[PDB]
Amino acid sequence: SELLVNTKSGKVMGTRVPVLSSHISAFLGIPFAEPPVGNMRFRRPEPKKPWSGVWNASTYPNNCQQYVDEQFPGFSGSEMWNPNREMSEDCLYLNIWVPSPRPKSTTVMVWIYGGGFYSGSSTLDVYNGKYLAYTEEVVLVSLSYRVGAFGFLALHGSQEAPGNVGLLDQRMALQWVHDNIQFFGGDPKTVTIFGESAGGASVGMHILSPGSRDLFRRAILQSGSPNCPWASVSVAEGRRRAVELGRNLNCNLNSDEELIHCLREKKPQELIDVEWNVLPFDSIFRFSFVPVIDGEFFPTSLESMLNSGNFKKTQILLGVNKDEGSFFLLYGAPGFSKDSESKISREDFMSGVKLSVPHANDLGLDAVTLQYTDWMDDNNGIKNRDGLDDIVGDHNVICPLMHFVNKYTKFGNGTYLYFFNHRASNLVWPEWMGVIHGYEIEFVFGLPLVKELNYTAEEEALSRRIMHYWATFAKTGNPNEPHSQESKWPLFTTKEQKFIDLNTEPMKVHQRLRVQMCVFWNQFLPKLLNAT
Amino acid sequence: SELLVNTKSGKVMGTRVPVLSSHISAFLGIPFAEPPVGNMRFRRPEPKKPWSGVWNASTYPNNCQQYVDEQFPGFSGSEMWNPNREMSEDCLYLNIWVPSPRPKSTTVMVWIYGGGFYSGSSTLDVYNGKYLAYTEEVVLVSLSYRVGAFGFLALHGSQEAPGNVGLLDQRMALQWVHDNIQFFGGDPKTVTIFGESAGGASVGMHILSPGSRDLFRRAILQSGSPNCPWASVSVAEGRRRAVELGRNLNCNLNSDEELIHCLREKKPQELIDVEWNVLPFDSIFRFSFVPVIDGEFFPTSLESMLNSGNFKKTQILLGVNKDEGSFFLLYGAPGFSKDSESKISREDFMSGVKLSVPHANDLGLDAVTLQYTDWMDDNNGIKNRDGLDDIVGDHNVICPLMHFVNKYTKFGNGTYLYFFNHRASNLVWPEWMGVIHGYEIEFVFGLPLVKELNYTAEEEALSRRIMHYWATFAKTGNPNEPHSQESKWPLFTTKEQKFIDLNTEPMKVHQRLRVQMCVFWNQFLPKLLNAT
Amino acid sequence: TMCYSHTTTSRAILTNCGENSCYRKSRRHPPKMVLGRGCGCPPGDDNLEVKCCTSPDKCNY
Amino acid sequence: TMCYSHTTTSRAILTNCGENSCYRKSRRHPPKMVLGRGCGCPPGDDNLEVKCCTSPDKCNY
Ligand SMILES: *[C@@H]1O[C@H](CO)[C@@H](O)[C@H](O)[C@H]1NC(C)=O
Ligand SMILES: *[C@@H]1O[C@H](CO)[C@@H](O)[C@H](O)[C@H]1NC(C)=O
Numbered sequence A, B: 001s002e003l004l005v006n007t008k009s010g011k012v013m014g015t016r017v018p019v020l021s022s023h024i025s026a027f028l029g030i031p032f033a034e035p036p037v038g039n040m041r042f043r044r045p046e047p048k049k050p051w052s053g054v055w056n057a058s059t060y061p062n063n064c065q066q067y068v069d070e071q072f073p074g075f076s077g078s079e080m081w082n083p084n085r086e087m088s089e090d091c092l093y094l095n096i097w098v099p100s101p102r103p104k105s106t107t108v109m110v111w112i113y114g115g116g117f118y119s120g121s122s123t124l125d126v127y128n129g130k131y132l133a134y135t136e137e138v139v140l141v142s143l144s145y146r147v148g149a150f151g152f153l154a155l156h157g158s159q160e161a162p163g164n165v166g167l168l169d170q171r172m173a174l175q176w177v178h179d180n181i182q183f184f185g186g187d188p189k190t191v192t193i194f195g196e197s198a199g200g201a202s203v204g205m206h207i208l209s210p211g212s213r214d215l216f217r218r219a220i221l222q223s224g225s226p227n228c229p230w231a232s233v234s235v236a237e238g239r240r241r242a243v244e245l246g247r248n249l250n251c252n253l254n255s256d257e258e259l260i261h262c263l264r265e266k267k268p269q270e271l272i273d274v275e276w277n278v279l280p281f282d283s284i285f286r287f288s289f290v291p292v293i294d295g296e297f298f299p300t301s302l303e304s305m306l307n308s309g310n311f312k313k314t315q316i317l318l319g320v321n322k323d324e325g326s327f328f329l330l331y332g333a334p335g336f337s338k339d340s341e342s343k344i345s346r347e348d349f350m351s352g353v354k355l356s357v358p359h360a361n362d363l364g365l366d367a368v369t370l371q372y373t374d375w376m377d378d379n380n381g382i383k384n385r386d387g388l389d390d391i392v393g394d395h396n397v398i399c400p401l402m403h404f405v406n407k408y409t410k411f412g413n414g415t416y417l418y419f420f421n422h423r424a425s426n427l428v429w430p431e432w433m434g435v436i437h438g439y440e441i442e443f444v445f446g447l448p449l450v451k452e453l454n455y456t457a458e459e460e461a462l463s464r465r466i467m468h469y470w471a472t473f474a475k476t477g478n479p480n481e482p483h484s485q486e487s488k489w490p491l492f493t494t495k496e497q498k499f500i501d502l503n504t505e506p507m508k509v510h511q512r513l514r515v516q517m518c519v520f521w522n523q524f525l526p527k528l529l530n531a532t
Numbered sequence C, D: 001t002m003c004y005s006h007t008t009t010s011r012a013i014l015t016n017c018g019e020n021s022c023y024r025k026s027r028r029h030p031p032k033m034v035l036g037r038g039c040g041c042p043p044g045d046d047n048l049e050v051k052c053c054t055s056p057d058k059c060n061y
């Protein structure tokens, strides 16, 4: 039948999920790796040994062991990102939505979830691909990968805890999509990976790594980048954090084998409790276990790779949101709160400013303060809130992405940039948070097409336009349909630097996304810090 | 009679100058020092030996040897500042306008002319005091002082060419006004000095120097300050420039006596030709011979004096103009011109930026560029012109004045700040130059009250309001009349930092004059340059 | 007293604490994150910031 | 050819240069200042920037 597909690793069987009016085929839970349990914890993944009989790919897989954020207990704005399935070490699975009837050879889009590398679940309702796969009639895959210590504990040198394990999990998922996706009606040659926050950084880390370049044709990076300040750490820093995780559990730190063996004896519950101790500083938008620039998975330093050109040269469609830093200010930054208009005082701005950029020195912090301050009104709670909102978004997302764009475009095979600035009409977050980090995914995944979700007519059109750009880009390698329609999304060029906004209003083509601020972050500050 | 006044140094006789409808007494040309000719060149001034008979103080004195700017041959905007009388080494004189009938004991205002310390003439038509003295019925004196090498050649150590000679000339003028001004109807106790550009810096240098503090009650600084970057040089820098002036004339540099004697043998014509060679760098708004921080006239470094408080503690009324840097861009800055709208290209902005601030390093120049650039339009000829106009005015006038204000206000006995932003309706300078450096003097001196000058009705009112503030401040020590009128010019305070604009529109009280830019110039950049 | 209850790997439920206190253990320094809730009031250190409240209900939010 | 004429201590007058050239000697580097005008065309150095023009009138402005 159609719900039956024989893959290289065994026979699989899915189900007919109802998509709006029609229905679609979905294979939920296909194993692409041996459950990284036992001694397999912290180690590189292994291929899923072929099974006998028909695998039942009808129900959503297990989520990976991670931290649950009960910051706002029962708040649908936060709880909707928490793992909805059962967490478990046996979580390396993938899901596939195939347009019914099965296609002969259609475009494949593989989604890589975000979560600061410490969280993530391919099973979220905002990651539901029946709408996108059905609408654009493309095969849609959403993978899984170990997060936190389980997927990123990194003691360089040791073979049982090397490092980029979470990315190795993604690569194994992609290699399965490479070998087997043709049996589901997908074109292994026209496969494009796309992800948000840490997933986008992963998409970027797959575009840089040699062993991952021939498993995808194109790519998309939403609000993320391989060079983001929070995305990577040296092989020393990660090692420091591994040992710290150990002494936090009373482990023998004499050697790697003694450390690693100890952490493996611990319940997964135990690792998550002492995971945030791993944070050495005291800040905002900085995580625990993240990829390490190995010199294996990542040949040289990301910057070196960007300069020389050492990276997969295809076309990319990347971008950011208006307010990327907002949510990140709710976890400690003085004066902020979900329940108020979070008007910040001068002295609390200075405090927060010290938290947003934990790497700068006093003169660098003076440089940051002077840049993001209205001296004619240094006490305006709204301006101080916003300039602090902007310091987190630019430093942590917008500028690192604009730095990646320019470097890549020198060897890229075409580039498109967007700026999603529409605020969901049915948003449960506080007005002052603006267009939040991760709040574009529901437009990409077509949620607004579901009447029961309470979006506006103009919002369905925006999701349809965004779904279309995404799919057309995946197939064509250009968002713009040839000899059809009128709206022309300008190809980003290092010269004119054109990009477009993504809102429910006419197609507006802008240029130079946050250039004054990103010149400060990208060029100037780095210069200052080194001369001092 | 009234035109006859016996002074401590001899009898003087003036004339009835017609002032509008009335007339007024004027003593033009009273000697306050022995003509600094012969060996007296470069040396400290000497008191004018008492004369026998009646001195004829009816015609304007000689102007001091200086450079004539024929940049725009026959341009009334430039030629009106050139010396109008005969230049001569025998130029130390002063003029006095006494309200008729002679007063018993009225307020005295002493004017100190500007000219970058290399030019100046108390005899200009914009320095004509019959209008101000007659209108506010105050005795008005305008002094003279050696400029350039003649008044500022400074070889620290030598007694024949010490240094602050030009300021010593002013102090001698003030001491004469102290002793003798009562015989003309002026109150030696209520005397207030006021000057523009270099004169204001002089007013500031008199407020800091011990030997000049008891010769005036109050003060006014128009577009100038003792701490301006161009107003002073070390005792070494000035010495370098003295020697340079020497080798430029083929002098024996073996020792001071041999150098100084040589320069004295030279015609005054010869010194002025090689005077600009004295400029060591390559820039804008930087002059040749300026006061040296002696450790005599100026106890310690100006900044030290400002910090500790070491300075005369009275009330001051100071301020600036909207466009102080404009005129200064017409002497070499690429792209500028009096005859065009001087639209600047990005590359010419970078060039000019390097000229405006000849002391900064590359990172400091990057700091300046990033601050004064619209990265969203780094090629806009108007924005580049203006940001370059602003770099010269802020760095060279506006910020050094705001730095002096805050320091002084900590020990001041009251402070008032203004921002003259009206553009003369009959201005012969190019529209893009805005409210130019020195273009307030004609409002202070009441020129706009003369129908033949072609000003507007509203402009006469502005000059009357400015003349009044100036005079009332001189008497009262507060611009604002008690229990009279409604407009209240806020006393500047280091806290709220209030000031007012000076234009032909309602009394608008603003706060924080160029704070974002002056935080950059005053606080940040200095920090950057030292950390590098 | 109705209060929230959970761990770092649990979703917040609303169990009933008796006449006992409800805590809200967190990471003292930013990111100040909740690492647990429930009935009681354990000790802490510079790193942990336990916040005990006996009223009203849902007081350990 | 009617041209300007003066020195560093003289105001610009308009004397008549014959069939001869008119110069405009200045300080090459900013502040590029006029240090003399008249008939002729003297030599210079890195510091001086003589600018000779034979037409039209007032060409050495
Ligand atoms: C596995 O497939 C069967 C066949 O319909 C389905 O009933 C069942 O729900 C699926 N998995 C589980 C765990 O129930
Ligand atoms: C000096 O005073 C006399 C008396 O009226 C006057 O005529 C003369 O103009 C004044 N000075 C000169 C140089 O003429």
Ligand SMILES: [Zn+2]
Pocket: A046, A047
């Ligand atoms: Zn193996």
Ligand SMILES: [Zn+2]
Pocket: A347
């Ligand atoms: Zn406080």
Ligand SMILES: [Zn+2]
Pocket: B046, B047
């Ligand atoms: Zn003497």
Ligand SMILES: [Zn+2]
Pocket: B347
């Ligand atoms: Zn060019």
